[PDB]
Structure formats: structure tokens, C-alpha cells
């Protein structure tokens, strides 16, 4: 099996410099036709392609971004190197690295990725609101409350709720993160039935997150039905 | 500079029907160097089918490519569970290489409408001066819906976010939050709060309010 790995700073400021590493291992830069490029996709966008360079060193650019784009292969350390100058938030993106095994098959084999954030702002954890149903006019079915993960970076939470007798919820609500200057946001909601909540003394559940920059955990209060 | 259009964007099938996906080129591609890939959202590409018609090492048979000149044409007969994700078709003909914006399948289930809740934004929060106003839209379908903001009345715009999940593994239904951010002043200056949804399986228009401080 062929191999490609990827590696590079995941956060960066703007008017900077990127550079990404594809580690690859299982041919050399050898045989004809043989190449490998890099193409990025920004989160919820399409593949977009910026850079190929073909073993005899031929290299073939996207104008829209070259004069800022450079290729490079060391034959001698396996790694093929990307270096992206004056880096924007538009640049935030995943970036992959694939190779082309000869002259039809294009891209066969694909890296995995690396999501690389550009912001201008820093590594921040989140910080929790909670969200209660300000519901009423009808509660009907079940009750629904949330929590607010905001203001951090880089684009990496996970959310898991527990009630005060400490076990575990059916919330499945995850909404991917929205990007409100510089710095990422995100929803966790559940709906708990209505039941439950018009009864115990439990005057609340739980929200747990655990971002790479602080594992927070706010408490949500139910809202007092029957 | 070969343009390559995809259509449509979005295709809604039920499993086991074929699928028939376009790929359309500004100009001819020399010699039909077109390529499909194959994504599921978190992974990364995988190659489906190259030259435009042949097969990729390892790869199943209800995967056809066919077509050349400026039309292209992946499908997909006995769609299976896991062929519900995203497509992208490429020319390699030339190098600047290009892709196209890709078409998702999804799952065909029937009408669904939303459950929705409104949430005022919490005391802490506001302290910060900074507010936010939530609506949640849960389990729905079909993908769209109208989310529209109203604050004493006035519709709002360029100060809402929106973040959509993608369809249900066990629902085939979708969820979405529509996120309503204002200064804390503006948003002691007023005192109704609205989301109205708009969605194919409401008869009428469901609207959703609180009044600041009554809750
Ligand atoms: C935490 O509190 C909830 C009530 O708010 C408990 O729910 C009830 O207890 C059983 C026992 O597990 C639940 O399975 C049911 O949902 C509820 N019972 C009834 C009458 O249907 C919940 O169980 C508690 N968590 C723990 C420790 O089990």
C-alpha cells in the first residue's frame, strides 16, 4: 500500500506564510506521468486545486493563486513541500495531497487532510451561555433547552450532556460551528420529555465540552412545567 | 481555463434507484482526461472513475462513467446506502486541473415539517454586552426551509448566522439553528422577538416569539 500524510501548522494569522508538508511513502518521484499536487477545500465548499509537480520537477500552477504559490520535492526525505504566501481567512481550508500512479489515473491515492484555521485572533477555549426554552403557548411533546459554546478557535468541540444524578442524555443536537470574527461558534440542544422535567427535584442537567484550550462544562436549568 | 458545471446540486433519489449525475465542460477536453471522485463529509476524495469511462482499482460495478466532448456522465444504478454522500468530477486534460462544485445525493424521504423553539439569550451572556437570539428548526424535509428574523417588526438582515446538520442517519430529516446576534443596547431598546419558519409541510407559516423579560 502507497501512503501520503500531511502536517503543517492548523492556526495561523493573516499576511503570513503557510507551508505543508505531504510525508509520503511507497514510490519515489521517479516514473513518468508519475506526479503528486495539492488541493485544499474550505469547510462546506468545493475541492479546488492549487499546485502539481511531476517527477523530472516539472511544476504546473492555478494562476488565480500562483505568484504566491510554490512547489517542492526532496526525493531525498520522501516529502513533497507547499508554501502559500500572504495568507487570508479565505485560505482556511483542508488541505490535501495526492499522487497520480501514471498519465490517466489521476489522484488514486489521497492524503487525509489537515485543517488549517487562519486567524488573526488566538487559541481561545470556549465559554458557555446556557440556552432555556423561553417555550410556552403551547410546551406540548417534550421541552428543549441548549448551550451556547462561543468564541473559540481553532474549530474543535464536542458536546455531551448529564443530568444532575450524573448519567447520560439523548441530544444527538449538534450544529457544525458557524465563524463570527476570527473566532468559531456553535449550538448543543436536547429535548428531554416533557414528563420528566414536570416533576424531579433535578433543577437542572449539565452541558460538557471538551475543546483543545479548556474542557468547560456550564450548567443548563430545566425550565419548571406540570 | 475549462469550466466544468455540475447539475444538479443537489439530487434526491431513494435507495436502490439509479442516479444519473451531469458533468458539463465550457469546451471540449482533450482527449476525455475527466475524473469522478467520490467524498463522504469528513473524509477525503476517492477515485471513482478516470478516462472518463474506466474503472478504478477497487471499486464497484454500478459506478459508470461515460460521455466525451464537453458532456460527461457518472451513474449510479442500486444506489446503496453508503452512495449517499458528495460527487466531483475533474478535468485533467490540461493542468491548470479543475473541478467541478459537486452534486450531493440525498435520501428522498417524505414531508416532514419543523418543531421549533425559541430561545432568549442568557442573563451571563448579556452581561458581556453581546446578545443572542436562537431559533432551532428540528427534524424536518425536505433541506428547505425560510428562517426570517423580526424585531419590533422590523426584518432583519446581515446579523444572523445559520448552521444546518446534515440529514439524519436514523431520520433522513434535517435540524437547523438560526443564530440572531445584536448589541446588548440595540437589544434592551426592544421588546418583541420573532422567528418565522417557512416550510412545505406547515399549512400557514409558523411563528415563534418572546417578549424581552417575560421569560
Ligand atoms: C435522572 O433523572 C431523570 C428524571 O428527571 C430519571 O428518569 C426517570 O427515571 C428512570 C430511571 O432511569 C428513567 O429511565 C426514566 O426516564 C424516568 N422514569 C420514568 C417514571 O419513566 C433518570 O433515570 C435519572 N438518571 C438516572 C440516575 O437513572
Known amino acids: 500500500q502507497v501512503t501520503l500524510k500531511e502536517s503543517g501548522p492548523t492556526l495561523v494569522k493573516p499576511t503570513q506564510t503557510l507551508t505543508l508538508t505531504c510525508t509520503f511513502s511507497?514510490?519515489?518521484?521517479?516514473?513518468?506521468?508519475?506526479?503528486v499536487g495539492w488541493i485544499r477545500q474550505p469547510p462546506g465548499k468545493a475541492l479546488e486545486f492549487l499546485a502539481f509537480?511531476?517527477?523530472?520537477?516539472?511544476?504546473r500552477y492555478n494562476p488565480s493563486l500562483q505568484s504566491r504559490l510554490t512547489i517542492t520535492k526532496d526525493a531525498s526525505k520522501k516529502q513533497v513541500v507547499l508554501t502559500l504566501t500572504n495568507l487570508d481567512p479565505v485560505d482556511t481550508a483542508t488541505y490535501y495531497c495526492?499522487?497520480?500512479?501514471?498519465?490517466?489515473?489521476?489522484?488514486?491515492?489521497w492524503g487525509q487532510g489537515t485543517l488549517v484555521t487562519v486567524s488573526s485572533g488566538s487559541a481561545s477555549a470556549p465559554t458557555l451561555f446556557p440556552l432555556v426554552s423561553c417555550e410556552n403557548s403551547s410546551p406540548s411533546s417534550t421541552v428543549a433547552v441548549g448551550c451556547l459554546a462561543q468564541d473559540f478557535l481553532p474549530d474543535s468541540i464536542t458536546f455531551s450532556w448529564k443530568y444532575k444524578n450524573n448519567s447520560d442524555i439523548s441530544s444527538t443536537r449538534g450544529f457544525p460551528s458557524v465563524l463570527r470574527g476570527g473566532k468559531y461558534a456553535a449550538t448543543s440542544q436536547v429535548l428531554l420529555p416533557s414528563k420528566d422535567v414536570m416533576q424531579g427535584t433535578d433543577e437542572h442537567v449539565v452541558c460538557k465540552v471538551q475543546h483543545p484550550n479548556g474542557n468547560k462544562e456550564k450548567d443548563v436549568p430545566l425550565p419548571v412545567v406540570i | 481555463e475549462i469550466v466544468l458545471t455540475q447539475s444538479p446540486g443537489t439530487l434526491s433519489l431513494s435507495p436502490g434507484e439509479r442516479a444519473t449525475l451531469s458533468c458539463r465542460a465550457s469546451?471540449?477536453?482533450?482527449?476525455?482526461?475527466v475524473a469522478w471522485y467520490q467524498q463522504k463529509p469528513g473524509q477525503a476524495p476517492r477515485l471513482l472513475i478516470y478516462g472518463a469511462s474506466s474503472r478504478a482499482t477497487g471499486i464497484p460495478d454500478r459506478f459508470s462513467g461515460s460521455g466525451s466532448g464537453t458532456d460527461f456522465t457518472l451513474s449510479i444504478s442500486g444506489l446503496e446506502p453508503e452512495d449517499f454522500v458528495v460527487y466531483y468530477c475533474q478535468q485533467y486534460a490540461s493542468s491548470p486541473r479543475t473541478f467541478g462544485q459537486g452534486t450531493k445525493v440525498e435520501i428522498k424521504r417524505t414531508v416532514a415539517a419543523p418543531s421549533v423553539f425559541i430561545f432568549p439569550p442568557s442573563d451571563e451572556q448579556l452581561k458581556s454586552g453581546t446578545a443572542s437570539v436562537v431559533c432551532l428548526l428540528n427534524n424536518f424535509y425536505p433541506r428547505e426551509a425560510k428562517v426570517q428574523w423580526k424585531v419590533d417588526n422590523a426584518l432583519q438582515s446581515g446579523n444572523s448566522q445559520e448552521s444546518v446538520t446534515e440529514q439524519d442517519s436514523k431520520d433522513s430529516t434535517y435540524s437547523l439553528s438560526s443564530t440572531l446576534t445584536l448589541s446588548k443596547a440595540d437589544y434592551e431598546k426592544h421588546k418583541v422577538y420573532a422567528c418565522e419558519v417557512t416550510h412545505q409541510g406547515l399549512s400557514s407559516p409558523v411563528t415563534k416569539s418572546f417578549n424581552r423579560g417575560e421569560c
Open positions: 511507497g514510490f519515489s518521484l521517479t516514473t513518468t506521468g508519475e506526479g
Open positions: 509537480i511531476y517527477w523530472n520537477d516539472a511544476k
Open positions: 495526492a499522487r497520480t500512479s501514471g498519465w490517466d489515473i489521476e489522484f488514486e491515492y
Open positions: 469546451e471540449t477536453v482533450s482527449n476525455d482526461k
